[PDB]
Amino acid sequence: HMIPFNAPPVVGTELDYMQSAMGSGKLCGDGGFTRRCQQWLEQRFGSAKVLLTPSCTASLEMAALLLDIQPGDEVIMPSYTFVSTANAFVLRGAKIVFVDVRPDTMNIDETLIEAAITDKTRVIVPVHYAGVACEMDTIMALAKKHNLFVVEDAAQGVMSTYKGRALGTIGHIGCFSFHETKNYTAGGEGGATLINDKALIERAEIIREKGTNRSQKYTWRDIGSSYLMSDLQAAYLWAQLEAADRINQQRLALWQNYYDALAPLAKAGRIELPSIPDGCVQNAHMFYIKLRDIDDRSALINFLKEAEIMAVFHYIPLHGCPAGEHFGEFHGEDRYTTKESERLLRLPLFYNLSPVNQRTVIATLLNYFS
Amino acid sequence: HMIPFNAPPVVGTELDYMQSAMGSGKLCGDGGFTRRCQQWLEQRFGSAKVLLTPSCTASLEMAALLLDIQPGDEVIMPSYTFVSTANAFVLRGAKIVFVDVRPDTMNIDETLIEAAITDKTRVIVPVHYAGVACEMDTIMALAKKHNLFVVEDAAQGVMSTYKGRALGTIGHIGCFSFHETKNYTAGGEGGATLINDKALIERAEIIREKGTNRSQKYTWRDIGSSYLMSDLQAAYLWAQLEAADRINQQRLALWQNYYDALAPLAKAGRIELPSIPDGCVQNAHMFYIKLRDIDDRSALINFLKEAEIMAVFHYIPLHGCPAGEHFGEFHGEDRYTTKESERLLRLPLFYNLSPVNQRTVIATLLNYFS
Ligand SMILES: Cc1ncc(COP(=O)(O)O)c(/C=N/[C@@H]2[C@H](O)[C@@H](O)[C@@H](OP(=O)(O)OP(=O)(O)OC[C@H]3O[C@@H](n4cc(C)c(=O)[nH]c4=O)C[C@@H]3O)O[C@@H]2C)c1O
Numbered sequence A, B: 001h002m003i004p005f006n007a008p009p010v011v012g013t014e015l016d017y018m019q020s021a022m023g024s025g026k027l028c029g030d031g032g033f034t035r036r037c038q039q040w041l042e043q044r045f046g047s048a049k050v051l052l053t054p055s056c057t058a059s060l061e062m063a064a065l066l067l068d069i070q071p072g073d074e075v076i077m078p079s080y081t082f083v084s085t086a087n088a089f090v091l092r093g094a095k096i097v098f099v100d101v102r103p104d105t106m107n108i109d110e111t112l113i114e115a116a117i118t119d120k121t122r123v124i125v126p127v128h129y130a131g132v133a134c135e136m137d138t139i140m141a142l143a144k145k146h147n148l149f150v151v152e153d154a155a156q157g158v159m160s161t162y163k164g165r166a167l168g169t170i171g172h173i174g175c176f177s178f179h180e181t182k183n184y185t186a187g188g189e190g191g192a193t194l195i196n197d198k199a200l201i202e203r204a205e206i207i208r209e210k211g212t213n214r215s216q217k218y219t220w221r222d223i224g225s226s227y228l229m230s231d232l233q234a235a236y237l238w239a240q241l242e243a244a245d246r247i248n249q250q251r252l253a254l255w256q257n258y259y260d261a262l263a264p265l266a267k268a269g270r271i272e273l274p275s276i277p278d279g280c281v282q283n284a285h286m287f288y289i290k291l292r293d294i295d296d297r298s299a300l301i302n303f304l305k306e307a308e309i310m311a312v313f314h315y316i317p318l319h320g321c322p323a324g325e326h327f328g329e330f331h332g333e334d335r336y337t338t339k340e341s342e343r344l345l346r347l348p349l350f351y352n353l354s355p356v357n358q359r360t361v362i363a364t365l366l367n368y369f370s
C-alpha cells in the first residue's frame, strides 16, 4: 500500500549465516558470530575493544555504569536526541544539563558547552545526528581541559567518519545501534559498546557478563547486567557487515538523489537541506528537510499520506518533556532546539528502497512545493 | 566429540517462522511475534500482562525499577542463585539479604525468611531452582503479613507449576529466561516480565518502552530502558512455544531415565537425587545429583571428561563472592548453601539429546560409582 519511511535492511544472506549459527549449537551471546562482528568493528573502525549489546540503550547504560556515574554528577548532552541518551545516565542518578543545537547539523553546539560545565560535570555525550559527526576535536579538547569523559552516542553513525576517524571511536566510550531503523541491523535490535579508553576494558568485560569474569571458577566480582545480544542476531549482523560498503554506497546514492532533486527549492529558500561540515563524512542514515514551521511540515505530511507515502518528524526536545524538567535542566536559551525540531521532516530512506519508489516520493514532493 | 552438558533446543520450524518475520518487514521489538508469544504466555499461564525482554536479567532489573527500589531498601533472596537475581536490585541501590536454602530442593528456606526481615525490607525474591517451585503459599502469606512484594525469579520455570499455578504468575512480578541453556530459547537470549499485580501494568509498559508512551506524538514520561527482544528472536521463541508440550514431555522422559537409573545408588546412600515437593510440577530443566563432597564431585567430573562427557557444577554462592560480601549480607548460619552447592552436579539434559548418548552417560555414571 504505502511507501514506508523505513524498512529493515535485507541483504539476502542473513538466513544462511543464521542457519550456520543454529547449526553450531551456540546461540547465546559472545558466540562465534558475536566475536567475528567485534573483530570486524575493531579493525575497520580502529577501536581497542568492541562489545555487542542488546541495544544502543544498553550500551549507553553500560557506559554510565563503566564511568561510575554517581547521584549529583552532571552530564551534558543535547535536548535534541533520543530518550535513551538521557535515561542511561539518569538511571545512575545523573543530572542532565542540556545544551542547544547548531541548526545546520542539529548537533550539539560545541561553542555553548563550556559555559554549561561546572565542578559537578563528569561526562559529555555528543550525538552524531543523521550520522553527521559533532565537532569532535573541539569537544575532546574541552573535555581534556576540564577532566571530563566523552561518551559518543554514535547510534546513527556506523560507517560515518570525522577527519578520517570512525564515529564511536573518538571518545573514551562509543555507542552504536543495530535497530531495524538503522543502516545496519542485528535482526531488528542490537547495539555495540566501543571501549576506546584501554584502561576501561577490563571492567567493561566484567560488567558486560553480569559482573562476573565469565570470560576466563567464575564468580560475582562487580555490578553488571546481561549486555549480550544473541549469536543469532550477530549472525544477521555479520551478514550485513559483509555488505557494509554495498549498503553504504547505495544509501549515499539515494541520499544524493534527494539532494539533487530538492536543491533548487533550497536555493529559492522554500526549504533547507542537511549540512555536512568540512571533514565530516556521513553514512546516509537520514535525509531530512526543514519546512518553514510545524504547519508547513504538517501540511506536507498530510499531502504525502494522501499519496500513500510515509514521511515522519523526529525527536521531541527532551528538556521540554515531563521527565526532562524533572531530571534535567536546559542551560542557556532554547534558541534552535525546539524551533528546528518542529520544522524537521525525515524522508523515506532505506537500503531496499526501489528507484521507482524514490522517484515517486520525489515527484510528489516537487508537487507539494508548487 | 564430546557429549555436551547442553545444546539449545531446535524444533525444526524456527527457520520458517523467522523467514516469515523477515518477510513482514518488521524485526524490532514489539512486532507480531512478540505479541503472539505474550498472548500465548498470558493465556496458558494466567498472567495479566507478559512483556518480552532481552534477558531474564532485564526482566529482574525491570522488576526492581517497577517497585521503585531506593538505596537502603533490603531485598531477601537465596545466596544459591545466579548473580543477576542480586545485580538487578543492587543496580537500584538495594542491600541484599541472603537466607539459607532448604537442602532437599536448594530453594530458599521459607521458614528462615521472617528472621531476616527488618523495617528496611521491601522485596523477597524466591528462585525456582531446577524449575521446582519454592514453598509459595507460605512465602506469599509471609509477604502479605509484612507488606512485602514478591518477585519470582522463575528463569528455570517455564511450564512448571505450583499447586496448579504456573510458576511466574504468583508473585506480584515474575521473570523468565529464554537463554540458550533453558528449556525454551528465543534464538539464544531472551526473557519475559510477568506483571501479575494489575496495578503495576501501566508503569511497566512505560519503563519497558524507554520511559515513553506507546499509545500509537510520544514523549519522555519516566525512567525506563530498551526492554525489547527483537521480533526475530520472538519468531524463534514462537516456534518453540508451538512445541511447548512436546519439548516438555521429551525433557521429562529423559529426566525420568536418569532418575530410574540412579535410584538404586541413591537408596544405597552413595548419592542424592533431586526432591520435588508435593504440589510441585517440574519441567525437567535440570537433573542434578549430590556427591559426598567437592572432591567426590571433582573426581566424577574428571572421570566423565575422560569419557568425553561434559558434566557441570552450578552457582557459586553469592554471599561468599567478592561482590556479595560488599553488596550483601548472609543472615544467620550458612548451614546448607555452601556445603550443598559443593556436592551438586548437573547431568547432560537438553531437548535434542539422543537416547543413545544418554545411555552412554548413564553407563559411564554407573561405572564410576563402582
Ligand atoms: C541518538 C540515539 N540514541 C539511541 C537510540 C536507541 O537505540 P536502540 O534502540 O538501539 O536502543 C536511538 C534510535 N532511535 C530510533 C529512531 O531514531 C527513533 O526515532 C525511534 O524509531 P521508531 O521505532 O519509533 O519509529 P520511527 O519511524 O523512527 O518514528 C515513528 C513515529 O514516532 C514519532 N516519534 C519519534 C521519536 C524519536 C520521538 O521522540 N517522538 C515521536 O513522536 C515519529 C514517527 O511518527 O526508535 C529507534 C530506536 C538514537 O537515535
Ligand SMILES: Cc1ncc(COP(=O)(O)O)c(/C=N/[C@@H]2[C@H](O)[C@@H](O)[C@@H](OP(=O)(O)OP(=O)(O)OC[C@H]3O[C@@H](n4cc(C)c(=O)[nH]c4=O)C[C@@H]3O)O[C@@H]2C)c1O
Binding pocket: A217, A218, A219, A226, B005, B006, B054, B055, B056, B057, B058, B081, B082, B084, B085, B127, B153, B155, B156, B176, B177, B178, B179, B181, B190, B191, B312, B313, B314, B315, B316
Ligand atoms: C535463577 C536465574 N536467574 C537469572 C538467570 C539469568 O537469566 P538470563 O541469562 O536469561 O538473562 C539465570 C540463568 N542462568 C543460566 C545458567 O543457569 C547458568 O548456569 C549460566 O550458564 P552458562 O552460560 O554460564 O553455561 P553453563 O553450562 O550452565 O556453566 C558453565 C560453566 O561455568 C561454571 N559456573 C557457572 C555459574 C552459574 C557460576 O556462577 N560460576 C561458574 O563458575 C559452571 C560451568 O562449568 O548462565 C545462564 C544464563 C538463572 O538461572
